[PDB]
Structures are given as structure tokens and as C-alpha cells.
JSON list of C-alpha atoms in Angstrom, two decimals:
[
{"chain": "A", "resi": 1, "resn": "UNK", "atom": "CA", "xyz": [0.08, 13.81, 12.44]},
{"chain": "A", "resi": 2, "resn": "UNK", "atom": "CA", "xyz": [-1.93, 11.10, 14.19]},
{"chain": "A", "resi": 3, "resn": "UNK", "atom": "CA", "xyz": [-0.78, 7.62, 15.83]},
{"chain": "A", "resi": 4, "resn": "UNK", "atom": "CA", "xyz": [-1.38, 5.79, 12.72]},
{"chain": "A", "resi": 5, "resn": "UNK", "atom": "CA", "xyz": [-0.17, 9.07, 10.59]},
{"chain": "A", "resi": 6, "resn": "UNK", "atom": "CA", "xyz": [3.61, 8.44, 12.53]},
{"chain": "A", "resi": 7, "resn": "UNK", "atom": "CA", "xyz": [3.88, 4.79, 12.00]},
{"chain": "A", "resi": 8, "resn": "UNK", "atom": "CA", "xyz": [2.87, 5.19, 8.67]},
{"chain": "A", "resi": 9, "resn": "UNK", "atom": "CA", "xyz": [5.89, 7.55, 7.94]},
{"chain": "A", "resi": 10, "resn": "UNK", "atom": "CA", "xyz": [8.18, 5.12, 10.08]},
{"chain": "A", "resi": 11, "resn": "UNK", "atom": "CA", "xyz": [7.21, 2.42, 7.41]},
{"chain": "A", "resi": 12, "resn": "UNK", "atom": "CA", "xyz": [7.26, 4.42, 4.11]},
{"chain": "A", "resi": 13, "resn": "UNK", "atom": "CA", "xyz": [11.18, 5.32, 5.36]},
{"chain": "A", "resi": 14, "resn": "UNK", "atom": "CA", "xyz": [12.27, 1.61, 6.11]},
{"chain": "A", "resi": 15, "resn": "UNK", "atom": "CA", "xyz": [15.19, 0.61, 3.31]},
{"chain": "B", "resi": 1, "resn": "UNK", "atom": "CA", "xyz": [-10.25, -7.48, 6.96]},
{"chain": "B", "resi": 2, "resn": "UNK", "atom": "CA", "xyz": [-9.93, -9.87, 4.18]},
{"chain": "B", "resi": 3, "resn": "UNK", "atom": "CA", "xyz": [-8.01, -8.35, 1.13]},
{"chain": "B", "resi": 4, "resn": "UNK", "atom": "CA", "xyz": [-7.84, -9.07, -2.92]},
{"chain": "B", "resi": 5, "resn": "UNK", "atom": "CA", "xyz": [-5.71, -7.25, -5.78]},
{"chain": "B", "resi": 6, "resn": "UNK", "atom": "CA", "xyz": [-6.53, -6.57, -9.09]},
{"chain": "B", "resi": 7, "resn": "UNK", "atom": "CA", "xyz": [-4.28, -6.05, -11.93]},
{"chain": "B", "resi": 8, "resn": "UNK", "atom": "CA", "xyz": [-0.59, -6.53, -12.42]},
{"chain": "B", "resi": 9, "resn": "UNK", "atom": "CA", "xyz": [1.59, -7.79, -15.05]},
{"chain": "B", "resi": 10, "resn": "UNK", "atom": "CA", "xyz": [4.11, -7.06, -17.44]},
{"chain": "B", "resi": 11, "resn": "UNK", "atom": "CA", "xyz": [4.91, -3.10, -18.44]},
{"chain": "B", "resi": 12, "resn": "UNK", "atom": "CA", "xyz": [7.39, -1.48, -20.94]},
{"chain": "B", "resi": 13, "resn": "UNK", "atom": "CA", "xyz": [9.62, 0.89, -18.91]},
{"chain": "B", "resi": 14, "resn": "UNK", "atom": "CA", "xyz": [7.71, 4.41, -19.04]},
{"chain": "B", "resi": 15, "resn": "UNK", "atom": "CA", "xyz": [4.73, 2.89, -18.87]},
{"chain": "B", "resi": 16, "resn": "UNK", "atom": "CA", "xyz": [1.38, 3.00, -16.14]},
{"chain": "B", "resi": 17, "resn": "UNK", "atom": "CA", "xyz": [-0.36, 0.28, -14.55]},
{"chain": "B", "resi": 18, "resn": "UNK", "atom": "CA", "xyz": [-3.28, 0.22, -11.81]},
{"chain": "B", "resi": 19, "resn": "UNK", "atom": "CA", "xyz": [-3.42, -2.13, -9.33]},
{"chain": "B", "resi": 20, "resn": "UNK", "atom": "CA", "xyz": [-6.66, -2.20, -6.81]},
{"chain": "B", "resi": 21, "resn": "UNK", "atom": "CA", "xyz": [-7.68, -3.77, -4.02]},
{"chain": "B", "resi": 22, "resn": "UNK", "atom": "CA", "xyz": [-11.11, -4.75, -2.01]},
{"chain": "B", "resi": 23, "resn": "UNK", "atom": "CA", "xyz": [-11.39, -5.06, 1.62]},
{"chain": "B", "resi": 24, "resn": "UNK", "atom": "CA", "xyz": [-14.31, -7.71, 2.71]},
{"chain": "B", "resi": 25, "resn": "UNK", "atom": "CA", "xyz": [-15.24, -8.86, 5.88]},
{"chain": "B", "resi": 26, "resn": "UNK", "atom": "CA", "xyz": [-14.96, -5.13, 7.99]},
{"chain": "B", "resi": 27, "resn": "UNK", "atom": "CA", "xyz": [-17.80, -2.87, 8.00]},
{"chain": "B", "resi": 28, "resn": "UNK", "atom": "CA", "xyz": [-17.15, 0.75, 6.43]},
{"chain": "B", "resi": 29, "resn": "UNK", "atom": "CA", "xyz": [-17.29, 2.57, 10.09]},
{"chain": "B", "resi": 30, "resn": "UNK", "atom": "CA", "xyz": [-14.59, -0.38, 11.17]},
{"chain": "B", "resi": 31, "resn": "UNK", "atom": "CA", "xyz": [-12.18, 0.18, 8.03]},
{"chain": "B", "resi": 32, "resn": "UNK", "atom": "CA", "xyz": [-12.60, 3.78, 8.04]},
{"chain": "B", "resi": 33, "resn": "UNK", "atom": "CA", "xyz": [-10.41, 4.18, 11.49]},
{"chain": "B", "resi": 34, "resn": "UNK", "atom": "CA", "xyz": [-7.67, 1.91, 9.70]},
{"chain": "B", "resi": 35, "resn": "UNK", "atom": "CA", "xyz": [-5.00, 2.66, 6.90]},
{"chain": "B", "resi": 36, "resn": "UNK", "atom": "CA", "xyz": [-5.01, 1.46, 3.52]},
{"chain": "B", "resi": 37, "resn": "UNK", "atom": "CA", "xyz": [-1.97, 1.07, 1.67]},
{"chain": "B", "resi": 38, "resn": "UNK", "atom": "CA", "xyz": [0.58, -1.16, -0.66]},
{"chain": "B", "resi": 39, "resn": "UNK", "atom": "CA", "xyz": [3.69, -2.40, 0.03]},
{"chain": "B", "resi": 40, "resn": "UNK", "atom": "CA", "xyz": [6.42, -3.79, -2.24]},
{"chain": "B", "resi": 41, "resn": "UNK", "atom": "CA", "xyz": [8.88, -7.41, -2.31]},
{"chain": "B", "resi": 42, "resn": "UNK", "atom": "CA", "xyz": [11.53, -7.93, -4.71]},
{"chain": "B", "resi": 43, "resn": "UNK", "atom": "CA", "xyz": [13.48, -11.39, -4.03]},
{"chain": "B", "resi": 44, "resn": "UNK", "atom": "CA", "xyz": [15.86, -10.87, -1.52]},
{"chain": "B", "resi": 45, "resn": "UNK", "atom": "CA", "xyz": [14.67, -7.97, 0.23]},
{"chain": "B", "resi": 46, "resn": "UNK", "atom": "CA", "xyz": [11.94, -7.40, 2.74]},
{"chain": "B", "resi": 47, "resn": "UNK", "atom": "CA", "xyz": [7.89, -6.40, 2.19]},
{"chain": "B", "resi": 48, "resn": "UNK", "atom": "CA", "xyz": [8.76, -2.51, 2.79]},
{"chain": "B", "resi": 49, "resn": "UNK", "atom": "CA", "xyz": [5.59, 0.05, 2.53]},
{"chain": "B", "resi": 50, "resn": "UNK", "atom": "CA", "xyz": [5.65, 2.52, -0.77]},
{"chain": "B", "resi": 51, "resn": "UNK", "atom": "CA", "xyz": [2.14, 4.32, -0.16]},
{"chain": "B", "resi": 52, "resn": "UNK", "atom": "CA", "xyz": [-1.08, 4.09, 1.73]},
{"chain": "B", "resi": 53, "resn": "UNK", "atom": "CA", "xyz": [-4.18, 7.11, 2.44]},
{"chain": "B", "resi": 54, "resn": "UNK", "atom": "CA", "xyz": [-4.39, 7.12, 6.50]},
{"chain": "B", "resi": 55, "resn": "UNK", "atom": "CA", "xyz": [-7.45, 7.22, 8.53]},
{"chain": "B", "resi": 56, "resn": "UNK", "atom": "CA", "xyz": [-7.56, 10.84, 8.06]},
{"chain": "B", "resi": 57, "resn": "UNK", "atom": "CA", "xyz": [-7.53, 10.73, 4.08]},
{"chain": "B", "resi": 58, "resn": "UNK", "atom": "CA", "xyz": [-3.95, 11.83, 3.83]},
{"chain": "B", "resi": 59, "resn": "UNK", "atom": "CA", "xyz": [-2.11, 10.11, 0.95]},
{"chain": "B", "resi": 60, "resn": "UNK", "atom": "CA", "xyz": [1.47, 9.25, 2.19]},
{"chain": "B", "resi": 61, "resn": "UNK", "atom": "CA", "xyz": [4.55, 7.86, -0.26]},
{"chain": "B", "resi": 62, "resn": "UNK", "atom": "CA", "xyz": [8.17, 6.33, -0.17]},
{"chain": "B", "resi": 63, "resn": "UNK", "atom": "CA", "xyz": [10.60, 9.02, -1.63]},
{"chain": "B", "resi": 64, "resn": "UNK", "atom": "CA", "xyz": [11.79, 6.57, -4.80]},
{"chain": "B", "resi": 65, "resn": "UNK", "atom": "CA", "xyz": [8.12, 6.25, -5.70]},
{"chain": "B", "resi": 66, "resn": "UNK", "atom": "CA", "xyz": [6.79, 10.18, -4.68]},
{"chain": "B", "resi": 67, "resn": "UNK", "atom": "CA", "xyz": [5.35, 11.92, -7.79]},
{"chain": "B", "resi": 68, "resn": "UNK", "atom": "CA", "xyz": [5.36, 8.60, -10.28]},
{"chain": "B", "resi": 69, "resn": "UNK", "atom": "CA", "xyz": [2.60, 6.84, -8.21]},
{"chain": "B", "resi": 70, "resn": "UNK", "atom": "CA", "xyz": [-0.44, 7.94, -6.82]},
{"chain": "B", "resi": 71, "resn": "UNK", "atom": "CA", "xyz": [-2.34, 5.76, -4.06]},
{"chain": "B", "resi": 72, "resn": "UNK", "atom": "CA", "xyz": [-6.50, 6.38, -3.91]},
{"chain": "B", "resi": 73, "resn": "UNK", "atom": "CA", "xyz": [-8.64, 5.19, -1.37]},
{"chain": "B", "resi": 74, "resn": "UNK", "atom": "CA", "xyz": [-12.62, 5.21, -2.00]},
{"chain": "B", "resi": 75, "resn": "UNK", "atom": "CA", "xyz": [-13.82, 4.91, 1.69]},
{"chain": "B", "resi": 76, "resn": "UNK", "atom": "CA", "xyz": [-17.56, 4.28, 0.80]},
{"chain": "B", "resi": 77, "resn": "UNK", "atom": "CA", "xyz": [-16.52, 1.24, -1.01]},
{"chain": "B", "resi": 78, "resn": "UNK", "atom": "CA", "xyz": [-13.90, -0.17, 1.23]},
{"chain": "B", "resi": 79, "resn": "UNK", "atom": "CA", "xyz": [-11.27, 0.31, -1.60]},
{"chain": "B", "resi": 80, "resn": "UNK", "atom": "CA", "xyz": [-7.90, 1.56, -2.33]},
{"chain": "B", "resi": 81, "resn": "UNK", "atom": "CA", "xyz": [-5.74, 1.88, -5.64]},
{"chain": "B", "resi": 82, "resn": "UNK", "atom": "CA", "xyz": [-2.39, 2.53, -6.58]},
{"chain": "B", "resi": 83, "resn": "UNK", "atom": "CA", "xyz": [-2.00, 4.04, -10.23]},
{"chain": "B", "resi": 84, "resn": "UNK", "atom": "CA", "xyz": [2.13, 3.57, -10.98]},
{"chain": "B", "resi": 85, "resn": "UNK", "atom": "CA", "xyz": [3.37, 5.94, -13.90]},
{"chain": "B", "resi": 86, "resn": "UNK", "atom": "CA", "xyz": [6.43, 6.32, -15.65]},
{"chain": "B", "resi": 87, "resn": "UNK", "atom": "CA", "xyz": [7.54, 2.43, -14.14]},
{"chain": "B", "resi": 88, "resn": "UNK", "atom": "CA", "xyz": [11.53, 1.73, -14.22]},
{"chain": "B", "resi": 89, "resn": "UNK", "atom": "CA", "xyz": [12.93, -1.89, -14.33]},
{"chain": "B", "resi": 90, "resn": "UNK", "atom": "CA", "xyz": [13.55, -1.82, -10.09]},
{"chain": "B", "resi": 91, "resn": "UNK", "atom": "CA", "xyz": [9.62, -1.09, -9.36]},
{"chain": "B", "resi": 92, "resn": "UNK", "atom": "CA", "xyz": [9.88, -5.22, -10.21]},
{"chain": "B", "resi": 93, "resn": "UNK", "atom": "CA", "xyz": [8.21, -6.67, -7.73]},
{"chain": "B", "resi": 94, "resn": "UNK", "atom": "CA", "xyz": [5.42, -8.24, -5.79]},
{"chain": "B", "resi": 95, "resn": "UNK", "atom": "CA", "xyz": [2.81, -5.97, -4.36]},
{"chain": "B", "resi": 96, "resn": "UNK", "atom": "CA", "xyz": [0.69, -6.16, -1.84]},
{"chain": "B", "resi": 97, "resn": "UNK", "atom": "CA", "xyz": [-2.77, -4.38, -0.69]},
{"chain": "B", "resi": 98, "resn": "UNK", "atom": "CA", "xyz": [-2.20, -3.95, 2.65]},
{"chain": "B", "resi": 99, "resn": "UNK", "atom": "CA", "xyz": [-4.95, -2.61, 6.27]},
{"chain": "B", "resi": 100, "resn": "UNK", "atom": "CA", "xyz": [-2.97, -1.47, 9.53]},
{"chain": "B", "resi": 101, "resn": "UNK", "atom": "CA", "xyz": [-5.44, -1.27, 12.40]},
{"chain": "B", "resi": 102, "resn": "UNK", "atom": "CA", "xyz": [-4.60, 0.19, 15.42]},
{"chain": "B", "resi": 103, "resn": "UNK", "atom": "CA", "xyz": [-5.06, -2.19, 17.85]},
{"chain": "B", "resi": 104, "resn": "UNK", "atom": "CA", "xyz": [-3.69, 0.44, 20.90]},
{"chain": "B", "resi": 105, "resn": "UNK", "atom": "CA", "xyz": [-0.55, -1.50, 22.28]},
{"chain": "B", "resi": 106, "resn": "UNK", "atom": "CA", "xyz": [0.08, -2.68, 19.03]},
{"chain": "B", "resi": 107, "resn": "UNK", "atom": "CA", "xyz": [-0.64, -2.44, 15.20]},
{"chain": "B", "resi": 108, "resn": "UNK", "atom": "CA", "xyz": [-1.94, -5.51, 13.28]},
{"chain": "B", "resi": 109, "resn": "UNK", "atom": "CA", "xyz": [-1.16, -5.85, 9.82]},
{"chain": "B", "resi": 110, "resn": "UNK", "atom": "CA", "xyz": [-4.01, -7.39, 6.80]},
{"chain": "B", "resi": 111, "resn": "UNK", "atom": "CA", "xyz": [-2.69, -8.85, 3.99]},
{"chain": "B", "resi": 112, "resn": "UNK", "atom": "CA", "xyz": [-3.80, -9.44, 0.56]},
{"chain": "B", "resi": 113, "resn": "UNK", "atom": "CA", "xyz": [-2.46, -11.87, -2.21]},
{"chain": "B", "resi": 114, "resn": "UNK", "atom": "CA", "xyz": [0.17, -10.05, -3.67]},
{"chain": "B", "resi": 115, "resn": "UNK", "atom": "CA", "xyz": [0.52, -9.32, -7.09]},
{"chain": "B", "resi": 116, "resn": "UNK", "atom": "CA", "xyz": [3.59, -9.75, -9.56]},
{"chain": "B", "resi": 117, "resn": "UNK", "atom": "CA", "xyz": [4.34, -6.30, -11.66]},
{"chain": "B", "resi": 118, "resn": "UNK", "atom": "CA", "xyz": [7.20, -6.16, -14.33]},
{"chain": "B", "resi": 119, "resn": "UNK", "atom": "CA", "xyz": [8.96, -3.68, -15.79]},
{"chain": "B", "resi": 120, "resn": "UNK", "atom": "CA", "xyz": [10.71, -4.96, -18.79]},
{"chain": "B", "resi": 121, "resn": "UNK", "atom": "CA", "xyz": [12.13, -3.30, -21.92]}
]
């Protein structure tokens, strides 16, 4: 995945 | 990056909407190096992110919203979409068309309007 690919999945698994 | 919805409303539970969004104000080479996405906001809880199509084309979801709701993202035309099948009453909420740039020590979020959707029997 790249750098924004990550944060992206960070966000999307935030309650 | 400016950002504007289209669509929302009220649904029956079951039902589809669309909701899209323009980005203005960033050329196409700019926005293409950026993420499109949505994010949701029910009172009382936080903006959290349910979907968004990365720099590299890849559509990414939330698990409660994976397989019900597609997010689409026409590059050319600085655009992205988020069709929303087979609603229940919790998708309730405001949503919001949503750019993250990478900005290299830090990411820099674009907002749009936000749009009310309802799911109501």
C-alpha cells in the first residue's frame, strides 16, 4: 500500500 | 480544493441513493496525487471516513458499509461518487465529500458541505 493507501485504512477503521 | 455534494435526502430502508461530489479550484494533475472519499456524522459522534478511491485508483471501505456501498471516482473530471444500496435506519447521517492531500509531514483534509441522508421506514 502507499503513504496515503495506510492512512486511508487508519481512517476507514476509526469507531 | 473546493468541494460540493449532490443528492441526499430521505430513503425507505432497502433502498439506494447516490450522492456526488465536484472538486474545483485544483488542476486534474494536482487532484490526481490526492484521495477522494466520504465520510459520515450522526449527532453525537465524530466525522469518521466510510470510503474513498486513493491516488492509485484503489476503492477502500469501512467494514459496516463494505459490499452495500460502492465509492467511484472519475479522475478526468475531478469527481467522486458514492452509490449506497440496501440503506438501514443507522446509515442516518450527514455526509461529507471529502480530498486528503499529502502534504509530507502532514495530511490536510478538504471539505465539502455535507449532506443530510435518511433512512426512514
Amino acid at each position: 500500500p502507499s503513504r496515503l493507501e495506510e492512512e486511508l485504512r487508519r481512517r476507514l477503521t476509526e469507531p | 480544493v473546493q468541494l460540493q455534494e449532490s443528492g441526499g435526502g430521505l430513503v425507505q430502508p432497502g433502498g439506494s441513493l447516490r450522492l456526488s461530489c465536484t472538486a474545483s479550484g485544483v488542476t486534474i494533475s494536482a487532484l490526481n496525487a490526492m484521495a477522494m472519499g466520504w465520510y459520515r456524522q450522526a449527532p453525537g459522534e465524530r466525522r469518521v471516513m466510510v470510503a474513498a478511491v486513493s491516488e492509485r485508483g484503489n476503492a477502500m471501505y469501512r467494514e459496516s458499509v463494505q459490499g452495500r456501498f460502492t465509492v467511484t471516482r472519475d479522475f478526468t473530471n475531478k469527481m467522486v461518487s458514492l452509490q449506497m444500496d440496501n440503506l438501514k435506519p443507522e446509515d442516518t447521517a450527514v455526509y461529507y465529500c471529502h480530498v486528503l492531500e499529502d502534504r509530507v509531514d502532514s495530511f490536510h483534509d478538504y471539505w465539502g458541505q455535507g449532506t443530510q441522508v435518511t433512512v426512514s421506514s
